[PDB]
Design a binder for this molecule. Structure first.
Ligand SMILES: C[As](C)(=O)[O-]
Ligand SMILES: C[As](C)(=O)[O-]
Ligand SMILES: [Zn+2]
Ligand SMILES: [Zn+2]
Ligand SMILES: [Zn+2]
Ligand SMILES: [Zn+2]
Ligand SMILES: [Zn+2]
Ligand SMILES: [Zn+2]
Lengths: 330, 328
């Protein structure tokens, strides 16, 4: 079976150790093309990303999933360039994030479904690169527009077998909202990762979703504004919980018997224009390991806590391949 | 003081009959590239725009100013292809419209100034095509962010000599609040067009801005949903006033002695994705002339009402050239 990447299809055996929720750059549609100097230059951004991916590769990573949507400024040509240079597979995304422009947010559920299908079945822009995942997002109480996006995502997943990754901004729960909508459309929970789940400490909430068959994205592990009391922007974006506390949720879910439902990532990037200026510097100061943080810090931490190799490989290799492999029915 | 167009620099004498507020396509950044099918295809949109601009050309139009900004999905390569095929000058825009994404709306006044300067001085994207105007938009009361945009526009204009064009959302006013900000930055009123000024019938407001040396953009002349009362989206976009009512404002300002302050346009486009689906069909149902509406309908209407042809030539040829020619 085959997974689409920015350099073409690859087999399941080629996927390897995967980071399921990452970005090369967090931006806005067309922004990198219109003002590349915001990032120093396109060339500087490419250099920062290639070095960062090569560090991750040296720590064991073989694939990342860039869950940047059109409205997060996804540039698949950038992804292809850095994937080739770093020799790390990149899966690209369709879907809608938090900042849809009018041309997206004025659209109907049917139109959004056709847009997602175009990006998965035909390709992104004029590149022939096909999305391998659908990324959606909601705020607090799912808005009428976000509900349209979720339903369109479920429909595109049902037609193509590609999985859906979702999260709730602003609050620590919210996965129940998305689950009810997805299920109303007939989508299998095994096609869905409820992301940014490490933002809550409510284990009962995560375990119940896992028991229903949802994948649980513990994918903002290195985000933390501890020590950055000076910075309101940093606390608002990364939060005030230690990375070890977040990582321990991984062990907790394993102990509950749901290793098979866990996906782990960094939610990192190599440039960011969608927040305050120079926020990349703040992030880099918190986590100098970048995307290598999971393999260099979290994996050893879990081992020390007594999680066996084979379990860690199940989480980092087996689960992502099962998740990404397009699967029409469960 | 040559003017930059999507085909390169031109002389003032080459500008000719100008439409000062137009669009090839009203969209969002990256959207035409991502989902061209929304417009049938990119190829269909080009064909429709070339056909339309050629009709305007035959009616005498020589230049249009496409005031689409980054966030209105300005695609300068589309502009260039259409300009060349139709053989009509197109001036491209920098600035910020009413849908800035986070990467724009999180920026400071200094950062916005740099962005506008890049698009004017260096070029748009990787094309080397330089913006010839700065477009800004406000809602009701200028928002804190919109005030940054206005100040950045003023600063970019002062540094480069290129003019600024505005508008305020809806059938509002807003010019007095825009002008205050511009003047606090030391910008000359002669470098600013208060656009969509045909949305109001308040002549006291219009004449006072004209008296201060502002240009008055009477530039949505064909927009009217009269006859389309059962379409709320039509009414909300084009209004309930007739084209003649809008066009009579041109006469009113001429009568008051302000012919030199008037700029006229259609605010037309050949595709639109930033609003309701298929809205282009509704607009085309009302104004089949498209961008040719000004020279075909408005000019003769004003002639019939007794305005001398020399005055109309001043408004359609002289005023736009004086406005577009960069100063310092
Ligand atoms: C690009 As994000 C901070 O919503 O994971
Ligand atoms: C794109 As418009 C409605 O400001 O002319
Ligand atoms: Zn997120
Ligand atoms: Zn995320
Ligand atoms: Zn993310
Ligand atoms: Zn407008
Ligand atoms: Zn307009
Ligand atoms: Zn307009």
């Amino acid at each position: 079976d085959r997974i689409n990447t920015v350099r073409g299809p690859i087999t399941i055996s080629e996927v390897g150790f995967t980071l399921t929720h990452e970005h090369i750059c967090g931006s806005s549609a067309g922004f990198l093309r219109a003002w590349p100097e915001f990032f120093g230059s396109r060339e500087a951004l490419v250099e920062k990303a290639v070095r960062g991916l090569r560090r991750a590769r040296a720590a064991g990573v073989r694939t990342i999933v860039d869950v940047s949507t059109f409205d997060l400024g996804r540039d698949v040509r950038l992804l292809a360039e850095v994937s080739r240079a770093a020799d790390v597979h990149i899966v690209a995304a369709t879907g809608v994030w938090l900042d849809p422009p009018l041309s997206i947010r004025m659209r109907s559920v049917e139109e959004l479904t056709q847009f997602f299908l175009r990006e998965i079945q035909y390709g992104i822009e004029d590149t022939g690169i096909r999305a391998g995942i659908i990324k959606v997002a909601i705020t607090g109480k799912v808005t009428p527009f976000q509900e349209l996006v979720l339903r369109a995502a479920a429909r595109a997943s049902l037609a193509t077998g590609v999985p859906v990754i979702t999260h709730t901004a602003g609050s620590q729960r919210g996965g129940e909202q998305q689950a009810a909508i997805f299920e109303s459309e007939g989508l299998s929970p095994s096609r869905v990762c409820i992301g940014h789940s490490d933002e809550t400490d409510d284990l009962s909430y995560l375990t119940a979703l896992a028991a229903r068959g949802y994948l649980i994205g513990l994918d903002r592990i290195p985000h933390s504004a501890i020590g950055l009391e000076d910075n309101a922007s940093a606390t608002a974006f990364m939060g005030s919980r230690s990375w070890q506390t977040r990582a321990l949720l991984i062990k907790a879910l394993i102990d509950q018997g749901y290793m098979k439902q866990i996906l782990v990532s960094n939610d990192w990037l190599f440039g960011i224009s969608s927040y305050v200026t120079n926020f990349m510097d703040v992030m880099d100061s918190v986590n100098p390991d970048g995307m290598a943080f999971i393999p260099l810090r979290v994996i050893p931490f879990l081992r020390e806590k007594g999680i066996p190799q084979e379990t860690l490989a199940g989480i980092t290799v087996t689960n992502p391949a099962r998740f990404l492999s397009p699967t029409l029915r469960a």
